[PDB]
Paper text:
Multiple strategies have been developed to modify monoclonal antibodies, including chemical conjugation and protein engineering. Recently, we identified a cyclic, 12-amino-acid peptide that binds in a cavity formed by all four IgG domains of the cetuximab Fab. Owing to the location of the binding site within the Fab, we have termed the peptide a meditope (medi-, middle, + -tope, place). Based on our observations, the peptide–Fab interaction does not affect antigen binding. Herein, multiple crystal structures of meditope peptide derivatives incorporating natural and unnatural amino acids bound to the cetuximab Fab domain are presented.
In addition to the substitution of Phe3 by tyrosine, Arg9 was also substituted with an alanine in the original cQYN meditope. To determine whether the loss of affinity of the cQYN meditope compared with the cQFD meditope was owing to this substitution, we constructed a Phe3Tyr variant of the cQFD peptide. The structure of this meditope variant bound to the Fab was very similar to that of the cQYN meditope (r.m.s.d. of 0.22 Å calculated over 12 Cα atoms). Moreover, the side chain of Arg9 mimicked the same rotamer conformation as found in the cQFD meditope. Thus, the lower affinity is likely to be owing to loss of the electrostatic interaction between the guanidinium of Arg8 and the backbone carbonyl of Gln111 HC caused by the hydroxyl group of Tyr3.
Author numbering:
A (entry chain A): 1 to 213
B (entry chain B): 1 to 134, 136 to 220
C (entry chain E): 1 to 12
């Protein structure tokens, strides 16, 4: 099988900048290379066929070049909507194979998260478990800290985080931190707090509530 | 318009078989080949095989033994079957079509079928409201739905039947120590619209046929 | 990097 090596594995750039994707083949393959774009939750989308040929409905800012073993996909002036993974594919030799891909991330200005906290629902407490959620919304860069405190006792090991991929419009991330307690434990305490640390905030921001309204 | 629509997400017991249907439209199966490509954590994009216009098949070398592709031209259906799945066969499976009948530049793709190889049993999620209060900042309110304790992935979440998309964030699911998945989906809306407007998350978990609409209100 | 089936993107 032909090995295709894509470089680098990850690219960070600002809008309006030029970006090049490299795809190197383990042996010559002429111009028998195709490029794809893959967005979050999406299928691959055909960008370029045969090293350099255009595809219907693909923006003119996408182009490709190269022959032999060294291929390049170019985006002359990146837009926020271009966030995706980019793959190359060779079909000079059976079976057709794909590269491991390059991840395209976009730079933007620092954005502080807007923070929101959600008590467990009465509906959930009926099942003996209490989930407390903290939302960090529309922030950048990706690095953030959430600290849970229950009656001033620092929480550890009982929370999980999920982070969205970059937003296609504003390039920001959002994050959910879920604190998970037994109903019994939840009922034995009053003040549930979520302290958020981020480069966009000059000081940590705390959101909290007292159990039982 | 060319479309390839695949069957729903599935759970497969280890050493058992995977079956997926590709239903196509906008072209005839007698004029184009249909390819199958999968995408896994361990091997990325991997071409599996193809059924051509005239019904011949090719299978990628490591799948010759366990793979078989068939079709029904008249019903516009392609049938993909793979035998004796192991954990590292867990992946998203795609059907695709090339620009021309004989080629391999895949211009059109199925939406993908996420396949989980696991001994665990299907379990539908519970849906809890993430209710706004004063969740209020600068006149903006946030609300959501907690979709908890299901298996396997995925779940789909929309708001107001697709009508509300602006401000929506559905988080990647995380696997809990109980071996079940959990996720939240949130949306920011104007504080003042909580009186007039209804907000409903539409949760769908196809592997368990759990289909739930949750009305989320201030408390 | 590798594709993540939960996020449906590469994860690095
Ligand atoms: C899965 O396991 C087999 C060995 O049982 C191995 O040869 C193959 O490369 C693996 N496939 C992956 C990592 O998807």
């Amino acid at each position: 099988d032909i090995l295709l090596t894509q470089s680098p594995v990850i690219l960070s750039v600002s809008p309006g900048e030029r970006v090049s994707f490299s795809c190197r083949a383990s042996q010559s393959i002429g111009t028998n290379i195709h490029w794809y774009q893959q967005r979050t939750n999406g299928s691959p989308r055909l960008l370029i066929k045969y090293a350099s040929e255009s595809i219907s409905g693909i923006p003119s800012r996408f182009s490709g070049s190269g022959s032999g073993t060294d291929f390049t996909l170019s985006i002359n002036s990146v837009e926020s909507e271009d966030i995706a993974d980019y793959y190359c594919q060779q079909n000079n030799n059976w079976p057709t194979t794909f590269g491991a891909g390059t991840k395209l991330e976009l730079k933007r200005t620092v954005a502080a998260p807007s923070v929101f906290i959600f008590p467990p629902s009465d509906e959930q407490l009926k099942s003996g478990t209490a989930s407390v959620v903290c939302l960090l919304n529309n922030f950048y860069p990706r690095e953030a800290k959430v600290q849970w405190k229950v009656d001033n006792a620092l929480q550890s090991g009982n929370s999980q985080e999920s982070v969205t991929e970059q937003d296609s419009k504003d390039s920001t991330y959002s994050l959910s931190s879920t604190l998970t307690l037994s109903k019994a434990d939840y009922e034995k305490h009053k003040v549930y707090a979520c302290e958020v640390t981020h480069q966009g905030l000059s000081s940590p921001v705390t959101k909290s509530f007292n159990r039982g309204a | 318009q060319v479309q390839l629509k695949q069957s729903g997400p599935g759970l497969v017991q280890p050493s058992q078989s995977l079956s997926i249907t590709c239903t196509v439209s906008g072209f005839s199966l007698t004029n184009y080949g249909v390819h199958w490509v999968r995408q896994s954590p361990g091997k990325g994009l991997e071409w599996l095989g193809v059924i051509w216009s005239g019904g011949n098949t090719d299978y990628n070398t490591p799948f010759t033994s366990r793979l078989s592709i068939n079709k029904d031209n008249s019903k516009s259906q392609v049938f993909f079957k793979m035998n004796s799945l192991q954990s590292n066969d867990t992946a998203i499976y795609y059907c695709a079509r090339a620009l021309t009948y004989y080629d391999y530049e895949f211009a059109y793709w199925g939406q993908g079928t996420l396949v989980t190889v696991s001994a665990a049993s299907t379990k539908g999620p519970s849906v809890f409201p993430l209710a706004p209060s004063s969740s209020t900042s600068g006149g903006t309110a946030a609300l959501g739905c907690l979709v908890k304790d299901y298996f396997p992935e995925p779940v789909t979440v929309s708001w107001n039947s697709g009508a509300l998309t602006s401000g929506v964030h559905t988080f990647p699911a995380v696997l809990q120590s109980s071996g079940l998945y959990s996720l939240s989906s949130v949306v920011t809306v104007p504080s003042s619209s909580l009186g007039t407007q209804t907000y409903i998350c539409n949760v769908n978990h196809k592997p368990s046929n759990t289909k739930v609409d949750k009305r989320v209100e201030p408390k | 990097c590798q594709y993540d089936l939960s996020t449906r993107r590469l994860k690095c």
